[PDB]
Amino acid sequence: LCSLDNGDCDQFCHEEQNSVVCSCARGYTLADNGKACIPTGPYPCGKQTLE
Amino acid sequence: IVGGQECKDGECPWQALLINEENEGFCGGTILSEFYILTAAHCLYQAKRFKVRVGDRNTEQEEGGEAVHEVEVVIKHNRFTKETYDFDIAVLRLKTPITFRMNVAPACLPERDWAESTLMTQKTGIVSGFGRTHEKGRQSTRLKMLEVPYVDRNSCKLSSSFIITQNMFCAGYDTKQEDACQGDSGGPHVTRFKDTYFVTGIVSWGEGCARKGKYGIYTKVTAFLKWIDRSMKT
Numbered sequence: 001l002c003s004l005d006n007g008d009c010d011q012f013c014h015e016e017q018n019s020v021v022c023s024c025a026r027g028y029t030l031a032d033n034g035k036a037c038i039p040t041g042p043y044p045c046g047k048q049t050l051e
Numbered sequence: 052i053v054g055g056q057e058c059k060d061g062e063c064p065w066q067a068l069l070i071n072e073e074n075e076g077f078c079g080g081t082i083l084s085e086f087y088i089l090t091a092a093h094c095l096y097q098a099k100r101f102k103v104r105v106g107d108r109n110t111e112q113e114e115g116g117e118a119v120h121e122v123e124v125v126i127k128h129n130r131f132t133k134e135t136y137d138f139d140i141a142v143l144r145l146k147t148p149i150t151f152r153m154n155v156a157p158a159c160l161p162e163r164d165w166a167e168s169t170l171m172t173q174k175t176g177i178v179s180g181f182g183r184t185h186e187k188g189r190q191s192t193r194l195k196m197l198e199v200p201y202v203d204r205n206s207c208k209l210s211s212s213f214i215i216t217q218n219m220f221c222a223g224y225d226t227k228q229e230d231a232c233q234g235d236s237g238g239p240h241v242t243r244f245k246d247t248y249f250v251t252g253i254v255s256w257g258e259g260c261a262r263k264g265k266y267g268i269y270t271k272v273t274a275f276l277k278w279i280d281r282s283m284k285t
């Protein structure tokens with residue numbers, strides 16, 4: 001599960017009632033596929049700037 | 052940073068520099084949000100009055116992207132011990148919010164369990180700062196970064212002359228001449244994960260710099276995530 005390539009999560013990976021559950025840091029919203037983390041603004045945390 | 056690499060444009064956005072009354076950098080910090088800065092508690096004894104500069108890569112001259120912020124509140128861990136440097140952590144609340152832009156952006160705060168099993172388990176992390184380029188030399192005028200391997204926990208205790216508490220972790224090399232140094236203290240130790248950088252450590256201390264048989268010691272951010280959270284709420 002989360003032990004397998006981070007459960008295919010972009011960021012945080014949890015196992016609720018078994019099975020992968022992905023989450024994201026503040027400033028990101030979980031994508032519809034529930035794995036990807038989508039930046040909410042021009043400068044999401046953890047991203048080098050290429051402004 | 053001894054023998055690292057110069058932070059190229061937009062590469063070390065989360066870096067913050069604590070400057071004294073003479074506008075000289077004496078410690079680093081990590082940008083956590085527009086209002087909060089993470090640094091080492093021991094750095095608070097390095098200067099009486101200090102401010103925080105962000106967006107700077109070369110201190111020799113202002114380019115136009117750097118910005119200075121005054122500190123409104125300083126939140127030092129009450130258990131910080133000047134003796135061993137245990138609980139070496141502090142959070143700074145700024146009077147005016149940081150404006151994110153080129154070279155200015157926060158690092159991500161990870162969750163505890165995930166960070167420990169997925170981040171600390173990584174092969175390496177990245178440390179950066181304006182500190183000394185050599186043990187005896189002067190503070191670097193350019194911002195530098197260094198990829199430092201995570202060091203086996205027990206393999207570290209063996210090499211240390213001082214006790215490595217659970218609020219500490221080690222990164223660096225045994226002989227190779229690369230390591231953080233004086234002046235990088237309080238600075239960012241971030242771990243990359245799928246092109247996203249998470250704060251994992253704070254430059255704390257070390258016996259000298261880049262010494263053979265010695266590693267750099269960092270305060271374990273995962274052991275203070277709740278503490279950090281509470282601090283960012285007050």
Ligand SMILES: N=C(N)c1cccc(C[C@@H](NC(=O)N[C@]23C[C@H]4C[C@H](C[C@H](C4)C2)C3)C(=O)NCCc2ccccc2)c1
Nearest residue numbers: 134135136186231232233255256257258259260261267268
């Ligand atoms: N190698 C690193 N990664 C690193 C990173 C940040 C800072 C340091 C060194 C810095 N570290 C410490 O002081 N560590 C302690 C650990 C413990 C408790 C305190 C007293 C003793 C015993 C020494 C502080 C230092 O030794 N001296 C301050 C001035 C100095 C700078 C450069 C060379 C010699 C002396 C090293």
Ligand SMILES: [Ca+2]
Nearest residue numbers: 109112113114
């Ligand atoms: Ca400058």
Ligand SMILES: [Ca+2]
Nearest residue numbers: 224225262265
């Ligand atoms: Ca060494």
